[model samples]
Target: MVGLIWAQATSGVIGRGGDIPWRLPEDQAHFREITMGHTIVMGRRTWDSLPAKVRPLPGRRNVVLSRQADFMASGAEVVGSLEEALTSPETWVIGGGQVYALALPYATRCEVTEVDIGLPREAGDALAPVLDETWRGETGEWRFSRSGLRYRLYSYHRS
Candidate 1:
């Protein structure tokens, strides 16, 4: 079976996503590392957040899940369910809150960019839950001074 990669950015005790205080370098690197030749599964919001040209994510196939969404890119596919969309090799579940929460249960591996910049508890917009002991994360790697910002990269997996 093809396994999914899951990850997120959040505060230590609390988190939000209205304004991520970090750069997106990790996502770019992860895309190159795991998605260059693979297919990615995402939600409609995640797809919409992307620029038009990248909706299909150039070097790989993109499969989105949305019953109400009817848009499709050159190599993009619309699958109403995760099971239907992930019928391919190396599928990743990259997200906004709902999709991440939805796919977390099925994810076998996770690649995280744990940013050190924590936010206030009241900063409510979006929050990502941390993967507990059940999910094994590789030692988080750090990347500072990226275009003048700091970030860390980590990979996780399920037993």
Candidate 2:
């Protein structure tokens, strides 16, 4: 009954600040395991950024939280509020910056894949707030190698 956020940040850090720095094999595999038949929630901007064919992600319920008068995502249901999106059973909040910010306090658990990269405070366009130790983090043993760059995977949960 916990909500998860599989953050696939860019530049080994949150992107839209820049391009992705490492490969996303771990994130892809994790999603396949956790959300195979579950619902995924996201904002219009994130949904729009995905390719139409792959979006509204297959084999799961898709809900888009949007304020757009004309926002549309094929194969995805639309909701105006986070509460409305979570009305069924329980749900996950997937995101871009805005969606993550709004859902942060309400989320019970976050399955984050933090990347290790040296980002000067000035270089980061923005960062998701750090998880207080109230949340425990497990750094996985596996690391991915792509383009000669490295990244590791981790998940966090509220204690």
Candidate 3:
């Protein structure tokens, strides 16, 4: 199963200045819960943006995609293409805009956390991929995080 997971603002902003623009601890926990035991694939930029201490992301196997043959990702395996990363029986394509877009077609499921905050589309360095009509999403009632940010979760599956 190939799943794509990410949190984005209402404007579709997933990142700014090389990192997520907002902080919602619950959302982070949600990410960890869903991806904990799965293999995660991310682009070089996403690998670089992760904190040094959590480079390998603990319990999950990390596979980073980079075109450079010599690129080293400390505790993670480096692959030249998305196909190589998908070798895992269960894989989750984590973000950094371009990787998400490239992996979209192969993704069977998507777990998205939508934040109520909004920013101009141009203000963000990365935006969430636009889900096409073939994908169907199930969303529940909006909930407020500890920080008071209103957010909602959506589970989408390719139909």
Candidate 4:
């Protein structure tokens, strides 16, 4: 069940300036609900963006990817190459854009939530990889909403 998980705005913006531009508690809860107790992989920037108190997400084995030879992510297994970090049978890529892009080819499934709002792309927008002909799946009605921002969950498996 190797999967990629992420939420994106209507404009294909997954992140901006090292942070998710929206404040949707529902989305956060969805992330935790699905990835809990699983081995999850993420890029160094994603790990860095996490609060210091929860650098390594609780209830999961955290794997952080970094190119630096001597980088140590506290409470995480640091791996230099992406391939070396993703050998788990039920791993989830919960990440920043670059990691999502890299993992898409290897992912057997994806859970994406599309928020019905548009945001301006920033210098570091780094969009999530599009789920095009390469993916076979379906999406449904609002899974949840917060602050007037509606979101729907979409599941895709590589075609």
The number of the candidate with the highest TM-score is 3
Candidate 2 lDDT, 7-67, residue by residue in tens: 5443334554443344556566776677768888877877776666778688888889898
lDDT of 3 by residue, 1-159 (tens): 899999999989999889898889999899999999889999999999999989989899999999999998899999998888998878999998999999998889999999998677874379999988999889978999988889999999974
Candidate 2 runs further than 4 Å off: 8-12, 17-22, 118-126
Off by over 4 Å in 1: 1-21, 69-74, 121-124
Candidate maximizing lDDT: 3
Which rank order by lDDT, best down to worst? 3, 4, 2, 1
* C-alpha RMSD between model 3 and the true structure: 1.1
Per-candidate TM equals 0.79, 0.80, 0.96, 0.94
Query: Worst 10-residue stretch by lDDT in candidate 3?
Result: 116-125
Q: Pairing residues by index, what is the TM-score of model 1? A: 0.79
Per-residue CA lDDT of model 1 for 1-159, tens digit only, reads 344443334453212443334456656766567767777787777777776766668777778888865666456788787679867756777665667677777777876665556454453454564577897666755766456546666677776
lDDT of all predictions: 0.64, 0.67, 0.92, 0.88
Question: TM-score-based ranking, best first?
Answer: 3, 4, 2, 1
Candidate 4 structure quality by residue, lDDT tens digits, 1-159: 689999999888988888888888888888999999999999999999998988889999999999997998889999999889898999999988999988888888999889988686667686988877877889888744748888899988863
Candidate 1: C-alpha RMSD after superposition: 3.2
- Scanning candidate 1 in windows of ten residues, the lowest lDDT window is 12-21
